[PDB]
DNA sequence: CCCGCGTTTTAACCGCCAAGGGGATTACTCCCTAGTCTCCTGGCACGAGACAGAAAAAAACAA
């Protein structure tokens, strides 16, 4: 049959609150950090720790950042987060101007 | 707008194979060092110095 739309992604966020895994794939994270760094200076070189530490530091503020999100779009009566909601939440942290 | 399902490809992994490059050993080559071989014109005349030196053992013959 068919599950209601918003129920299998309730069973996502249980799914995912209850599990540690890192949730973006590892090499094209490699990859953009390399990009990233290649722009500071040139023929760089990273240890796999230090990449992990990146990693693991933006899943957990991505993840503080979505936490803010929706709770700023369930202030506003509201369901789905939108641009809007990041930026109000960025804004009151104060990391936007 | 956003969710839930149907279809495609590669990207992430592994295994094996084949181009292309790096290190220890090996092919030469160049320079240096080390060690030899041979020669020093055609000759001619005359002279003078080297006639080995010690020591052990068997035999002849005087006594």
């Known amino acids: ?23 973006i794939r590892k090499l094209p994270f490699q990859r ?33 950042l979505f936490e803010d999100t929706n709770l700023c779009a369930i202030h506003a009566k509201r369901v789905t987060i939108m641009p809007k909601d990041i930026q109000l939440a960025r804004r009151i942290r104060g990391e936007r101007a």
């Open 32 to 64: 953009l950090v390399r990009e990233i760094a290649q722009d500071f200076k040139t023929d760089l070189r990273f240890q796999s720790s230090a990449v992990m530490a990146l990693q693991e530091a933006s899943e957990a503020y991505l993840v503080a």
């Open 1 to 23: 049959h068919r599950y209601r739309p918003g129920t299998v992604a309730l069973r996502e966020i249980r799914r995912y609150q209850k599990s540690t895994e890192l949730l």
